[PDB]
Amino acid sequence: GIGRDKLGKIFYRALTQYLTPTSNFSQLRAAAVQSATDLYGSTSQEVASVKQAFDAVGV
Amino acid sequence: SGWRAPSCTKVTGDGAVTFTTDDGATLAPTTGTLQSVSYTHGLVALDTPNTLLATHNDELQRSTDAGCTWTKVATLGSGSTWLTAATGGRAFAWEKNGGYLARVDGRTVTKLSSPSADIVGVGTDKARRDHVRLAGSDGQLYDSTDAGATWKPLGKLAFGPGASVYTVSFDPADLDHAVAGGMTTGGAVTTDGGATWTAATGLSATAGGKSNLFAASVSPADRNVVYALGIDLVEAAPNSGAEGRHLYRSTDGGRTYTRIVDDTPDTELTNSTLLAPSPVDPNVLYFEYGTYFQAYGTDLYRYDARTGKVGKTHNAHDGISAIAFNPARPSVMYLGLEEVQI
């Protein structure tokens, strides 16, 4: 439930605003969820789909 | 004999560590040539006269002539470690956001068992060479009284449960004074070893605005002065066109911050800009920007709070990954270098 444009916005914002060269997978998840929350709101389908995508790999 | 300035003009070493006497305008040549891919995240001057330790990838290195000669001591378990000096010829190597933790006693390397698999800071008690302290990425401090042999949790979480903590920086004069930085949670400060934390203000220009604090460094020359790297997340609201990145300065030990440097082409900042406060002048902060990209090289910046301006020097290396100061002549700066081009 995330197209190419929204994917780029979410992960570009996560990288540039929230991540460091030593960030691990746990922090990537926190950064991606927060970035999608910034862009689309905490109750959005975008946040739900990001959460689930990381939930899928047990993180 | 005590600490002295380096008694050389050229460094016998593999190229990972050099020194400058003029704030980076000239760098001492090294016999060896640094090779891709290389980082030197670990570099400290010890209290032992003329002795430094460095980690060049997983190679632990040592100098006993104040940086004129560097020799391999051991291979560490991690290829990416930071160094924290302890009193009496001792240091701790640790991987930031990793689990590796080891002690260096002179030339002896002892693997330790970290109480955290995601270490975001380490501090030593200069009055008790066995008292070492460690922070995990949830914001938990851990205390040890046996040179890191065994550990126990200490105090409460810097930002409460569920937080992602980028850093905990310990005051080198006092392990009980620490600054923590987190994701959206801004900064916190403790003066009692993690028993109570106070939330910092001033990282966002908007009252109560969210912020990130990626890195902080307490001035070795004044416990009240703290330099920090962070982002004003209100300024960096979606669609704003601003990343909101600044360097900050506190004069109350980490309770309140003021912006001192903005992210511009003249002073370029990233989420991992190295902070190197002067060990003798609380007004002065060194920081860096470097990139392989387009062979730009490396700027070594120097901020002076007396005037609020930033000067810089430039070298051709891909980056400066670590900085230490000669304790006898702090105008002599040791630089650990990066080479990353493919």
Side-chain angles (χ1 to χ4, degrees), chain A residues 5-33:
Chain A
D5 176 76
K6 290 185 176 173
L7 186 76
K9 284 172 182 175
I10 290 168
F11 281 87
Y12 180 85
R13 180 169 184 82
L15 284 176
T16 75
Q17 305 296 148
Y18 294 109
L19 291 175
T20 80
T22 61
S23 283
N24 53 23
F25 200 87
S26 173
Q27 198 165 73
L28 172 59
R29 176 206 185 97
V33 166

Side-chain angles (χ1 to χ4, degrees), chain B residues 231-256:
Chain B
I231 280 179
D232 176 347
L233 288 164
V234 173
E235 187 187 3
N239 213 28
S240 71
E243 293 181 18
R245 194 173 292 99
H246 309 268
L247 297 189
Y248 299 87
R249 187 176 197 253
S250 168
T251 56
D252 53 20
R255 302 178 63 75
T256 62

Side-chain angles (χ1 to χ4, degrees), chain B residues 112-276:
Chain B
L112 298 178
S113 273
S114 173
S116 169
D118 198 356
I119 309 158
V120 304
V122 175
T124 57
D125 195 334
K126 302 332 162 314
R128 324 181 38 220
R129 64 185 310 266
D130 284 334
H131 190 198
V132 58
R133 198 162 284 176
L134 183 147
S137 69
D138 58 348
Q140 182 62 61
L141 302 195
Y142 303 87
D143 194 291
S144 170
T145 45
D146 43 17
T150 57
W151 296 86
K152 95 213 311 203
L154 179 69
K156 65 182 62 164
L157 300 177
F159 304 101
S164 185
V165 174
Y166 293 115
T167 183
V168 175
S169 176
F170 296 100
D171 183 343
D174 181 12
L175 262 191
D176 303 318
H177 185 201
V179 156
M183 186 189 300
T184 79
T185 62
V189 64
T190 183
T191 55
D192 61 2
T196 175
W197 296 89
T198 310
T201 62
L203 299 172
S204 170
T206 300
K210 287 188 333 286
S211 65
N212 300 326
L213 195 165
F214 297 111
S217 200
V218 172
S219 177
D222 187 356
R223 80 174 262 125
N224 293 319
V225 166
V226 187
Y227 292 102
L229 162 75
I231 280 179
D232 176 347
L233 288 164
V234 173
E235 187 187 3
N239 213 28
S240 71
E243 293 181 18
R245 194 173 292 99
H246 309 268
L247 297 189
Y248 299 87
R249 187 176 197 253
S250 168
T251 56
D252 53 20
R255 302 178 63 75
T256 62
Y257 291 93
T258 288
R259 295 181 180 180
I260 58 164
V261 178
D262 300 329
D263 181 10
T264 71
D266 285 6
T267 51
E268 296 226 47
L269 306 176
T270 73
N271 300 349
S272 55
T273 292
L274 173 65
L275 308 182

Side-chain angles (χ1 to χ4, degrees), chain B residues 14 26 31 39-40 98 103 106-107 110 117 121-122 141 167 182 187 204 215 218 225 229 231 304 323 334:
Chain B
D14 65 8
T26 64
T31 54
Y39 296 90
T40 314
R103 194 183 54 235
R107 221 174 175 279
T110 301
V122 175
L141 302 195
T167 183
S204 170
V218 172
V225 166
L229 162 75
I231 280 179
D304 183 354
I323 294 164
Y334 299 95

